[PDB]
Design an enzyme around this catalytic site. Structure first.
Site, PDB file in Angstrom:
ATOM      1  N   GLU A  33      -7.745   2.375  -8.017  1.00 48.30           N
ATOM      2  CA  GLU A  33      -9.383   2.246  -7.462  1.00 48.30           C
ATOM      3  C   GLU A  33     -10.377   2.811  -8.629  1.00 48.30           C
ATOM      4  O   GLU A  33     -11.313   2.041  -8.668  1.00 48.30           O
ATOM      5  CB  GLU A  33      -9.461   3.389  -6.193  1.00 48.30           C
ATOM      6  CG  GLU A  33     -10.733   3.607  -5.786  1.00 48.30           C
ATOM      7  CD  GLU A  33     -10.894   4.806  -5.107  1.00 48.30           C
ATOM      8  OE1 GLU A  33     -11.251   5.897  -5.583  1.00 48.30           O
ATOM      9  OE2 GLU A  33     -10.652   4.882  -3.809  1.00 48.30           O
ATOM     10  N   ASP A  94      -7.752  -2.611  -1.837  1.00 45.25           N
ATOM     11  CA  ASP A  94      -9.087  -2.660  -2.006  1.00 45.25           C
ATOM     12  C   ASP A  94      -9.276  -2.699  -3.645  1.00 45.25           C
ATOM     13  O   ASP A  94     -10.310  -3.025  -4.289  1.00 45.25           O
ATOM     14  CB  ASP A  94      -9.705  -1.271  -1.601  1.00 45.25           C
ATOM     15  CG  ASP A  94      -9.135   0.139  -2.056  1.00 45.25           C
ATOM     16  OD1 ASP A  94      -7.944   0.160  -2.402  1.00 45.25           O
ATOM     17  OD2 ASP A  94      -9.960   0.878  -2.450  1.00 45.25           O
TER      18      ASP A  94
HETATM   19  O1  LIG Z   1       8.320   4.848   2.461  1.00 51.71           O
HETATM   20  C1  LIG Z   1       8.044   5.918   3.139  1.00 51.71           C
HETATM   21  C2  LIG Z   1       6.963   5.805   4.080  1.00 51.71           C
HETATM   22  O2  LIG Z   1       5.980   4.576   3.292  1.00 51.71           O
HETATM   23  C3  LIG Z   1       4.887   4.227   4.137  1.00 51.71           C
HETATM   24  O3  LIG Z   1       4.183   3.124   3.194  1.00 51.71           O
HETATM   25  C4  LIG Z   1       3.288   3.903   2.469  1.00 51.71           C
HETATM   26  C5  LIG Z   1       3.418   3.534   1.066  1.00 51.71           C
HETATM   27  O4  LIG Z   1       4.850   3.970   0.540  1.00 51.71           O
HETATM   28  C6  LIG Z   1       2.395   4.351   0.189  1.00 51.71           C
HETATM   29  O5  LIG Z   1       2.483   3.536  -1.136  1.00 51.71           O
HETATM   30  C7  LIG Z   1       1.051   3.958   0.642  1.00 51.71           C
HETATM   31  O6  LIG Z   1       0.350   4.573  -0.386  1.00 51.71           O
HETATM   32  C8  LIG Z   1      -1.181   4.356  -0.069  1.00 51.71           C
HETATM   33  C9  LIG Z   1      -2.066   5.618   0.227  1.00 51.71           C
HETATM   34  O7  LIG Z   1      -1.687   6.083   1.401  1.00 51.71           O
HETATM   35  C10 LIG Z   1      -3.507   5.177   0.079  1.00 51.71           C
HETATM   36  O8  LIG Z   1      -4.146   6.433   0.283  1.00 51.71           O
HETATM   37  C11 LIG Z   1      -3.815   4.530  -1.254  1.00 51.71           C
HETATM   38  O9  LIG Z   1      -5.225   4.037  -1.375  1.00 51.71           O
HETATM   39  C12 LIG Z   1      -5.977   4.308  -2.620  1.00 51.71           C
HETATM   40  C13 LIG Z   1      -7.174   3.376  -2.527  1.00 51.71           C
HETATM   41  O10 LIG Z   1      -7.296   2.843  -3.544  1.00 51.71           O
HETATM   42  C14 LIG Z   1      -8.395   4.367  -2.053  1.00 51.71           C
HETATM   43  O11 LIG Z   1      -9.462   3.448  -2.323  1.00 51.71           O
HETATM   44  C15 LIG Z   1      -8.142   4.911  -0.893  1.00 51.71           C
HETATM   45  O12 LIG Z   1      -7.432   4.383   0.221  1.00 51.71           O
HETATM   46  O13 LIG Z   1      -7.478   6.084  -1.689  1.00 51.71           O
HETATM   47  C16 LIG Z   1      -6.624   5.630  -2.514  1.00 51.71           C
HETATM   48  C17 LIG Z   1      -6.893   5.816  -4.195  1.00 51.71           C
HETATM   49  O14 LIG Z   1      -7.154   7.156  -3.951  1.00 51.71           O
HETATM   50  O15 LIG Z   1      -2.977   3.562  -1.422  1.00 51.71           O
HETATM   51  C18 LIG Z   1      -1.717   3.620  -1.326  1.00 51.71           C
HETATM   52  C19 LIG Z   1      -1.116   2.278  -1.670  1.00 51.71           C
HETATM   53  O16 LIG Z   1      -1.245   1.391  -0.696  1.00 51.71           O
HETATM   54  O17 LIG Z   1       0.950   4.452   1.961  1.00 51.71           O
HETATM   55  C20 LIG Z   1       1.691   3.834   2.968  1.00 51.71           C
HETATM   56  C21 LIG Z   1       1.612   4.139   4.209  1.00 51.71           C
HETATM   57  O18 LIG Z   1       1.529   5.426   4.216  1.00 51.71           O
HETATM   58  C22 LIG Z   1       5.568   3.429   5.608  1.00 51.71           C
HETATM   59  O19 LIG Z   1       4.471   3.022   6.107  1.00 51.71           O
HETATM   60  C23 LIG Z   1       6.327   4.480   6.086  1.00 51.71           C
HETATM   61  O20 LIG Z   1       7.055   3.586   7.219  1.00 51.71           O
HETATM   62  C24 LIG Z   1       7.288   5.253   5.266  1.00 51.71           C
HETATM   63  O21 LIG Z   1       7.947   5.820   6.151  1.00 51.71           O
HETATM   64  O1  LIG Z   2      -9.276   7.766   0.916  1.00 48.96           O
HETATM   65  C1  LIG Z   2     -10.718   8.127   0.677  1.00 48.96           C
HETATM   66  C2  LIG Z   2     -10.762   8.671  -0.631  1.00 48.96           C
HETATM   67  O2  LIG Z   2     -10.766  10.215  -0.860  1.00 48.96           O
HETATM   68  C3  LIG Z   2     -10.920  10.787  -2.118  1.00 48.96           C
HETATM   69  O3  LIG Z   2     -10.564  11.996  -2.411  1.00 48.96           O
HETATM   70  C4  LIG Z   2     -11.448  12.784  -1.204  1.00 48.96           C
HETATM   71  C5  LIG Z   2     -10.435  13.266  -0.233  1.00 48.96           C
HETATM   72  O4  LIG Z   2     -10.078  12.254   0.568  1.00 48.96           O
HETATM   73  C6  LIG Z   2     -10.556  14.558   0.309  1.00 48.96           C
HETATM   74  O5  LIG Z   2      -9.414  14.794   0.850  1.00 48.96           O
HETATM   75  C7  LIG Z   2     -11.044  15.545  -0.283  1.00 48.96           C
HETATM   76  O6  LIG Z   2     -11.170  16.649   0.311  1.00 48.96           O
HETATM   77  O7  LIG Z   2     -12.340  14.988  -1.243  1.00 48.96           O
HETATM   78  C8  LIG Z   2     -12.456  13.884  -1.871  1.00 48.96           C
HETATM   79  C9  LIG Z   2     -13.654  13.174  -2.013  1.00 48.96           C
HETATM   80  O8  LIG Z   2     -14.716  14.053  -2.220  1.00 48.96           O
HETATM   81  C10 LIG Z   2     -10.223   9.996  -3.420  1.00 48.96           C
HETATM   82  O9  LIG Z   2     -10.530  10.649  -4.592  1.00 48.96           O
HETATM   83  C11 LIG Z   2     -10.378   8.456  -3.380  1.00 48.96           C
HETATM   84  O10 LIG Z   2      -9.843   7.950  -4.516  1.00 48.96           O
HETATM   85  C12 LIG Z   2     -10.253   7.997  -1.968  1.00 48.96           C
HETATM   86  O11 LIG Z   2     -10.447   6.689  -2.027  1.00 48.96           O
END
Ligand SMILES: OC[C@H]1O[C@@H](O[C@H]2[C@H](O)[C@@H](O)[C@H](O[C@H]3[C@H](O)[C@@H](O)[C@H](O[C@H]4[C@H](O)[C@@H](O)[C@@H](O)O[C@@H]4CO)O[C@@H]3CO)O[C@@H]2CO)[C@H](O)[C@@H](O)[C@@H]1O
Ligand SMILES: OC[C@H]1O[C@@H](O[C@H]2[C@H](O)[C@@H](O)[C@H](O)O[C@@H]2CO)[C@H](O)[C@@H](O)[C@@H]1O
Ligand SMILES: OC[C@H]1O[C@@H](O[C@H]2[C@H](O)[C@@H](O)[C@H](O[C@H]3[C@H](O)[C@@H](O)[C@H](O)O[C@@H]3CO)O[C@@H]2CO)[C@H](O)[C@@H](O)[C@@H]1O
Length: 338
Positions: A33, A94
């Site tokens: 991201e 995203d």
């Molecule tokens: O394998 C055990 C468990 O896995 C579950 O799937 C996970 C997956 O392993 C994991 O990689 C993925 O992680 C997400 C993360 O939760 C998410 O917050 C992050 O998103 C980015 C995104 O760019 C942002 O803009 C915003 O969303 O925050 C972050 C950057 O800060 O993306 C990663 C990758 O997708 O989460 C999955 C679901 O939890 C299985 O679902 C489960 O069944 C298994 O038990």
């Molecule tokens: O999933 C949304 C977003 O969260 C960002 O960090 C947040 C966090 O979710 C929250 O727990 C914490 O208290 O504050 C920060 C923001 O002020 C994270 O940096 C992002 O990458 C993510 O997309």
């Protein structure tokens, strides 16, 4: 010439080697991201040197050298005291989308076929690995290539496909043509009280899972939905329908002058005060001049420091748009302020 807040962001958050560092994590992480937003801002700022610096870091450290062949791993940082490396190889779609769009627009505006070729290959890989046809919905964008799809349930993140980017990507045909329609319906159908959820599940034979739940909230993901909608060009025929569905967030922010930290999607009950980044994120969204000026004052007086990556990037988008640092065309192209 320069965009001061971006110049400061480069100095305070981007390593010499081109990685965006979130200092608030003890592992001093980079996310896909953060890379994707830095590409966008570098393009908006007409800053090809930093665009390339960030792109090369992303390629080499998240994508095994080539995002067209490997979707970027989403999380990188200190795994142990002698090992800085990928912390989770899964993708975040995203970021993948923002990288693809930024490459395609950089290739078009800087007249650089290398960026276009990479953007096309990455876009195709997104379609192959994190777009699936969900029974009942049609094609949908999964939040990542693993972890969000099971036989009977899927989990989506409404912030992950900005409507203007969905509109831009329809130029590439299917599945983007249909995804733009399913994305628009996702946004309308999952905000029953006018608040979009961070995450929302769809269950086979049952539909959208919108029952009240302390985890079905508009929070730190969904704040971006309002920001993307606000930054749509007024001549995009669908902007009005999205503003109208999400109007309760504008009315609630105007009422006490505080963007809420979390809003219960099913009941509309707010809790907490959002950080300064939420104030900036609503600058493009709020249509009323007084409500928008209240939030503008907060961003002016509480501008994010160097220990606040997420509020800083939300401010570069929201204050940036408020200052005409970039615009989107009706088709979702960058209309640059160069
Ligand atoms: O394998 C055990 C468990 O896995 C579950 O799937 C996970 C997956 O392993 C994991 O990689 C993925 O992680 C997400 C993360 O939760 C998410 O917050 C992050 O998103 C980015 C995104 O760019 C942002 O803009 C915003 O969303 O925050 C972050 C950057 O800060 O993306 C990663 C990758 O997708 O989460 C999955 C679901 O939890 C299985 O679902 C489960 O069944 C298994 O038990
Ligand atoms: O999933 C949304 C977003 O969260 C960002 O960090 C947040 C966090 O979710 C929250 O727990 C914490 O208290 O504050 C920060 C923001 O002020 C994270 O940096 C992002 O990458 C993510 O997309
Ligand atoms: O081999 C995969 C890629 O590795 C890249 O080098 C990385 C190093 O392996 C890693 O040790 C180093 O970690 C730095 C971190 O960048 C820095 O922010 C922190 O303060 O110190 C850490 C330890 O020095 O990161 C680099 C990437 O930044 C190669 O550059 C790359 O070619 C190769 O594909």
């Amino acid at each position: 010439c320069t965009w001061p807040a971006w110049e400061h962001f480069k100095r305070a958050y981007i390593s010499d080697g081109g990685r965006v560092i979130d200092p608030s994590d003890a592992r001093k992480i980079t996310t896909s991201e953060g890379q994707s937003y830095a590409l966008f801002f570098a393009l908006a700022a007409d800053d090809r040197p930093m665009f390339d610096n960030v792109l090369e870091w992303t390629k080499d450290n998240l994508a095994q050298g080539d995002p067209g062949e490997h979707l970027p791993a989403w999380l990188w940082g200190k795994k142990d005291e002698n090992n800085w490396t990928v912390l989770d190889s899964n993708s975040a779609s995203d970021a993948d989308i923002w990288i693809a769009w930024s490459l395609l627009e950089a290739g078009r505006l800087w007249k650089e076929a290398r960026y276009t070729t990479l953007g096309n290959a990455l876009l195709n890989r997104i379609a192959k690995e994190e777009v699936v046809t969900v029974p009942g919905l049609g094609p949908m964008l999964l939040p990542g290539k693993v972890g969000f799809a099971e036989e009977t349930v899927w989990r989506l993140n409404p912030s992950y496909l900005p409507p203007q980017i969905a509109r831009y990507l329809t130029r590439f045909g299917e599945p983007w043509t249909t995804l733009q329609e399913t994305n628009h319906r996702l946004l309308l159908e999952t905000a029953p009280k006018g608040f979009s959820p961070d995450w929302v599940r769809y269950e086979k034979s049952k539909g959208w899972q919108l029952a009240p739940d302390k985890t079905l909230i508009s929070g730190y993901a969904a704040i971006r939905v309002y920001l993307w909608v606000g930054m749509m060009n007024d001549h995009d025929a669908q902007k009005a329908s999205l503003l109208e569905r999400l109007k309760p967030m504008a009315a609630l922010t105007a009422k006490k002058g505080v963007v809420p930290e979390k809003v219960d999607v099913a009941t509309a009950q707010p809790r907490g005060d959002g950080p300064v980044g939420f104030a900036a994120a609503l600058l493009p969204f709020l249509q009323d001049r007084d409500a928008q000026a209240v939030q503008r004052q907060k961003v002016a007086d509480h501008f994010p420091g160097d220990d606040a990556y997420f509020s800083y990037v939300l401010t570069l988008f929201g204050q940036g748009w408020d200052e005409h640092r970039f615009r989107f065309t009706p088709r979702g192209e960058l209309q640059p302020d160069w």
